[PDB]
Amino acid sequence: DIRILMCPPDHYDVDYVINPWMEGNIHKSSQERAVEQWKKLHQTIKECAIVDLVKPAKGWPDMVFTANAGLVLGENVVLSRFYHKERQGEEPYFKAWFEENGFTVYELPQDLPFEGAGDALFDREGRWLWAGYGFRSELDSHPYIAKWLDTEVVSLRLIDERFYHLDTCFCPLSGGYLLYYPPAFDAYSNRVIEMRIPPEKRIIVEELDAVNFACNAVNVNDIIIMNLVSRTLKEKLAEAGFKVRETPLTEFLKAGGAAKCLTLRVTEPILPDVHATVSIESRVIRMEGHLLDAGILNQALDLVVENSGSFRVLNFNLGVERNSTSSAEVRVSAPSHQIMEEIMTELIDLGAVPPPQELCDINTETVTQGGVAPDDFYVSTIYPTEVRVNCEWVQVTGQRMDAAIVVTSNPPSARCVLLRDLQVGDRVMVGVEGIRTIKSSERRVELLVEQIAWEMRQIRDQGGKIVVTAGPVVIHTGGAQHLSHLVREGYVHALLGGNAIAVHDIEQATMGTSLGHRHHLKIINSVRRYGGIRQAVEAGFISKGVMYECVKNNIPYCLAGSIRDDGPLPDTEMNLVRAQSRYSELIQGADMILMLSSMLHSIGVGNMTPSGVKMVCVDINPAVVTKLVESVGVVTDVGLFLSLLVRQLQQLTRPY
Amino acid sequence: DLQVGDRVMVGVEGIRTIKVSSERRVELLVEQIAWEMRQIRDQGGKIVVTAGPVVIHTGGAQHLSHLVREGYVHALLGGNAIAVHDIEQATMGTSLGHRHHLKIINS
Numbered sequence A: 001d002i003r004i005l006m007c008p009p010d011h012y013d014v015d016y017v018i019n020p021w022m023e024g025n026i027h028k029s030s031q032e033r034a035v036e037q038w039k040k041l042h043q044t045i046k047e048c049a050i051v052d053l054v055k056p057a058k059g060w061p062d063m064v065f066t067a068n069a070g071l072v073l074g075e076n077v078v079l080s081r082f083y084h085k086e087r088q089g090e091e092p093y094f095k096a097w098f099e100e101n102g103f104t105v106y107e108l109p110q111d112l113p114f115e116g117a118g119d120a121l122f123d124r125e126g127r128w129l130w131a132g133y134g135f136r137s138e139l140d141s142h143p144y145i146a147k148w149l150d151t152e153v154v155s156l157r158l159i160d161e162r163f164y165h166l167d168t169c170f171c172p173l174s175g176g177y178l179l180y181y182p183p184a185f186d187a188y189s190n191r192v193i194e195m196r197i198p199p200e201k202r203i204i205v206e207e208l209d210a211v212n213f214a215c216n217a218v219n220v221n222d223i224i225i226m227n228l229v230s231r232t233l234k235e236k237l238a239e240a241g242f243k244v245r246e247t248p249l250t251e252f253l254k255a256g257g258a259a260k261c262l263t264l265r266v267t268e269p270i271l272p273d274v275h276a277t278v279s280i281e282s283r284v285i286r287m288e289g290h291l292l293d294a295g296i297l298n299q300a301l302d303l304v305v306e307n308s309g310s311f312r313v314l315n316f317n318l319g320v321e322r323n324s325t326s327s328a329e330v331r332v333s334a335p336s337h338q339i340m341e342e343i344m345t346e347l348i349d350l351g352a353v354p355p356p357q358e359l360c361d362i363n364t365e366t367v368t369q370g371g372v373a374p375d376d377f378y379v380s381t382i383y384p385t386e387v388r389v390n391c392e393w394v395q396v397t398g399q400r401m402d403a404a405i406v407v408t409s410n411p412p413s414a415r416c417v418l419l420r421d422l423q424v425g426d427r428v429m430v431g432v433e434g435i436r437t438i439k440s441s442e443r444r445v446e447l448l449v450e451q452i453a454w455e456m457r458q459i460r461d462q463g464g465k466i467v468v469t470a471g472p473v474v475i476h477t478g479g480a481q482h483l484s485h486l487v488r489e490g491y492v493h494a495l496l497g498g499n500a501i502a503v504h505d506i507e508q509a510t511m512g513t514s515l516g517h518r519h520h521l522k523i524i525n526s527v528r529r530y531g532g533i534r535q536a537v538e539a540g541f542i543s544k545g546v547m548y549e550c551v552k553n554n555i556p557y558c559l560a561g562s563i564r565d566d567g568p569l570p571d572t573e574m575n576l577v578r579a580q581s582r583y584s585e586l587i588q589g590a591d592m593i594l595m596l597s598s599m600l601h602s603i604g605v606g607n608m609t610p611s612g613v614k615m616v617c618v619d620i621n622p623a624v625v626t627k628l629v630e631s632v633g634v635v636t637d638v639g640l641f642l643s644l645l646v647r648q649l650q651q652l653t654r655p656y
Numbered sequence B: 001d002l003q004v005g006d007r008v009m010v011g012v013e014g015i016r017t018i019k020v021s022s023e024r025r026v027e028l029l030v031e032q033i034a035w036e037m038r039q040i041r042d043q044g045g046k047i048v049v050t051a052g053p054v055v056i057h058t059g060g061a062q063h064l065s066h067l068v069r070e071g072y073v074h075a076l077l078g079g080n081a082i083a084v085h086d087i088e089q090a091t092m093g094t095s096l097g098h099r100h101h102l103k104i105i106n107s
Helices: A031-046 A091-100 A139-149 A187-196 A207-211 A231-239 A296-306 A339-348 A445-461 A472-476 A480-488 A499-511 A518-530 A533-539 A546-552 A576-587 A599-608 A638-653 B023-042 B061-069 B080-092 B099-106
Strands: A003-006 A050-053 A070-073 A076-079 A104-107 A120-122 A129-133 A153-157 A170-173 A177-180 A202-204 A218-220 A223-226 A243-246 A281-287 A310-317 A327-334 A363-366 A385-389 A392-397 A404-408 A413-417 A427-430 A435-437 A465-470 A494-498 A557-560 A590-596 A614-618 A631-634 B048-050 B075-077
Touching: A003 A031, A031 A050, A031 A223, A070 A091, A070 A139, A076 A091, A076 A139, A091 A104, A120 A170, A129 A139, A129 A170, A139 A153, A139 A310, A139 A327, A153 A187, A231 A243, A281 A296, A281 A339, A296 A310, A296 A327, A296 A339, A327 A339, A339 A435, A385 A404, A385 A413, A445 A465, A445 A590, A445 A631, A445 A638, A465 A480, A465 A599, A472 A480, A472 A499, A472 A638, A480 A499, A480 A546, A480 A638, A494 A499, A494 A576, A494 A599, A499 A518, A499 A533, A499 A546, A499 A557, A518 A533, A533 A546, A557 A576, A576 A599, A590 A599, A590 A638, B061 B080, B080 B099
Parallel strands: A003 A050, A076 A104, A129 A153, A177 A202, A223 A243, A392 A413, A465 A494, A465 A590, A494 A557, A590 A614, A614 A631, B048 B075
Antiparallel strands: A070 A076, A120 A129, A170 A177, A218 A223, A281 A327, A310 A327, A363 A427, A385 A392, A385 A435, A404 A413, A404 A427
16 A cells, blocks of 8 residues: 655646746746646556545645655654745645644754655665755754654755755665666765665666656656656666656646656655664854954855755854954754764864863874874864863974874873874874864066065064075076075075976076086086085085075075986985975974975975965966965066065165 | 936935856866756747857857757857858868958958
8 A cells, every 4th residue: 555645736837936947937837738747647656556635725836746745654744844935835734634634743943944755765675764955954954853753864965956856866766776866966975875775776867867857756666657768767777677657747847846746655664673863963163263254154164064064053142342252153963973073173273162061182092003093083284283181281283284193191292293103002183072273477566575575574683484495497587696695695594495496506507507408417417526515515616506505604405306306416305204304394493484486395395384384485377376364375477576575675674 | 328317326325236177077067057058948038149259269160050050049249250260161161371361251
C-alpha cells in the first residue's frame, strides 16, 4: 500500500518571482494544457499507487506542488515553513489535511524555514533521510526533524539557484540507488554522497538531463515516472531494474516544478534500529572586534556560508558612543563535526568563544612520527595568537603562517614550529578550542612613495629592521644606483635575493651592460675565481653596485638558489632548508619589508613574515600587487619606484 | 531635449527608489548565461546585442550569425567597422591589408 498525495490545478497561475524559473513567466501559463498534463500524470501514478487528492484554494496557485506540503514519516508530518510569504498562506490548508487524515502534525519555528519533501528525501531503503539546505531550508532546522521523526538526517548543501530544491537534483531510487546531479552540490556534500552510496549505485545525469528536471521523478518499485528522458539516461536507467514511463509537464516548469514536485508520498517506511541522531554541530561565538563600521561581520558570515555552514545573528548591542565598540553574539552551525573546525579557525582571527562556559584550554597531541604532525593539528596564521595553557593565556612566539603550534608544559610556552622541525614527543596544538588572536598601472604612485619614504625615515631613525628582497628586475630597470644609495644611507639592514640579481648587478657594475648571454658566465667565473663576492670586492674587481655596498657597509645578504641558476656564485645557497633558515634569521625583528620584483621570493618571504611588519610590494604585473592596510602594493616599474623613493627620501633627510 | 518652461526636479527632496579566467570557469559562466538566454527567448523577451569588429577578428562571425538566425538577437548596435569586416569575410574569406576594406566599401 503506497499512497501519494496530489492537488489539481483548479486555481493554478503564475504570479510570483519566488525562484529563477518564474522570472519572465508571470501569467504566461495556459491552464488547459496544465490540466491535461496534470490529469495524464495523475492517471499514470494511479496505475502504480493510491493517489489521494486535496481541494485547492483560490489565491494559492502554487498549491499544486504537494511535495512542499511537508515531510511525512509514519503518521508523523513536519509541516513546512515556507521561505517566501507567497506560499506561507497555503500552509493552513495543508496542515488542515494532515490533521484531517490522522497525522501527528509538527510545526517548525516561524523563523526556521523548511520546504518539506522538496528538500527532504528519504533513502528508499529507509536507513536515513537526505535533507538539503541553502536556499529555502535552514541547516538549523535539520536537528529538529531528526528529533521529531526519530531518523537520521544527512545534510546536503545546494549551490545552484536553478536547483534550489533537493528533489530537482536528487532522487533516491529503490535497490539502494541514487539518481543525482553532482554539480548542484558543494564539494563536501558530494564527498558525503559518495561516502554513503557505492559508485555502482550512483546514476549521474548530464547537464541536459538536469535542466529538464530529470531528477524530479517519482519512483514506485521499478517504474519511474518523470518529465523527459535522454536516450542515454533512459538506457542507463534500463540497465538498472527500473522501467521509465515519461509524461509531459512543460506547463509546470514555468514555475520550476516537475513530477516529483507535484507528488508527496504519505506512506513512508519506519525502521526501528536507526532511532534518532544527526551529525550537525552548533556553537555560539561572540565578536568584540570594533569593526562594526568597515564590515567585519560580513566577512564572518560570508566565510560561514561559503564553507557550507549556517548562521543566525542572535544579539546585536551597539555602544553608547563612538568609543564603545558594537559587539554581537552569533550561533554558527555546520553539517560535519569538524567543518566547524574550518569555520572556527577562519573565525578565530576576529573573535573568541563566549566567556561564561565555552572557554576551554587547548588540546595537544604528542608527535609519534618524526617531522609529521598528528592530523587535525591547528594551522597557524600570520596574526599574533594566544593559547590557553594551564588556565592562563600564553603568547605564541615566532608567529608564522602555515606552521604548527608546539606547546611546552612545565615552562608553559607556545611557539610556531615547522612540520619538518617537529621532534618526537612534541606537544602540537590540535582542534580549534582555546585559541584567540589580538589586534592598469598606478597613475599617481608618488603619493604612495611619499608615504613609504616618510615611514622608512621614521623606522630608520629609531633603530628598526628593514629588509629588501631583490630580483634581477631591479637591475634591468635601472635601479642599481638607487638601491645602492638606499644601502649606503642605512635604509637596508638585510638583503634577500638569489643568484641572478647578484650576477646582473656585478655585470652592470663591471661591464656596464646587464641581462649575449655569455657575459653572465664571464662574471660568474671571475667571481668564483675570487672565491666569493666579499673577496671580489676587497680585491677591487667589483667597485660599485648593490652587492658592493652590501659588503662594504657590512649588510647581511642571502642568495637562495634556483633550478635556473646558470652558475652558483660561491655565496649562493643551494640547500634550500639552510636558505629558508637564513631567511627567517635575517627577517627577524624587521619593521618593513621592501619587496622589489621577485614574485617567487615575495610569496615565500611573506609566508615567513608575521603580520605586524609593513609589506611594500612593487610590480607592474599588477596582479602580483595583490598581497593581503598593513601591507601596501604599488603598480609601477620598480626602477621608477626606487628613483622616486630616493628623491623623496632626499627631500626628507636633506635639509642641508 | 529640454524644452522651455519644463519643470525639472531639483534637489534631493521627495525622490525615492523602488529599486583572464580559465576556460573551465568560462564554460560555467557560459552555461549560466545560455540558460538565462534560453529562458528569455522562450518568452516574448527582447535580447539586444552590441557588437564590434572583434567579433569578426576572432572567428565569431559564424557564431553571431547563428545567434541571429536562431532568433536570439532582436536588435544589433554596432558601427561601420564591424559591418565592413563582416561583409569582407563573407565576400573574400578574410578580414583586415587595408586595401580589401575600401573595395568592399566601394562595392
